[PDB]
Amino acid sequence: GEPKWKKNTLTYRISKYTPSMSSVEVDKAVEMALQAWSSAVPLSFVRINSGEADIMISFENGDHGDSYPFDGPRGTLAHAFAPGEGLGGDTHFDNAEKWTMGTNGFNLFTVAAHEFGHALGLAHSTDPSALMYPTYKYKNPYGFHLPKDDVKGIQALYGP
Ligand X SMILES: COc1ccc(S(=O)(=O)N(CC(=O)NO)CC(C)C)cc1
Catalytic residues: 115
Q: From CA 16, how far away is CA 19, in angstroms rounded?
A: 10
Torsions phi, psi of 151, nearest 5? Answer: -75, -50
Is residue 63 part of the contact set for Zn ion (CB under 5 A)? no
Q: Which stretch binds Zn ion (CB under 5 A): 18-26, 27-35, 42-50, 92-100?
A: 92-100
Name which position in 92, 94, 110, 121 contacts Zn ion (CB under 5 A): 92
Contact 48, 11 (CB under 8 A): yes
Residue type, 62: G
Question: Least distance (Å) from ligand X to the CB of residue 133?
Answer: 6
Does residue 145 have a known ligand-binding role?
Answer: no
Residues making contact with ligand X (CB under 6 A): 75-80, 110-111, 114-115, 118, 134-137
Cα distances from 54 to residues 33, 47, 102, in angstroms, run 17, 10, 29
Q: Which residue is nearest to ligand X (CB)?
A: 114
Is residue 66 part of the contact set for Zn ion (CB under 5 A)? yes
Query: Nearest Cα to 74, choosing from 44, 105, 46?
Result: 105
Torsions phi, psi of 58, nearest 5? Answer: -160, 160
Binding site feature residues for Ca(2+): 52-54, 71-72, 74, 76, 85-86, 88, 90, 94, 97
Q: Which residues bind Ca ion (CB under 5 A)?
A: 71, 76, 89-90, 94, 97
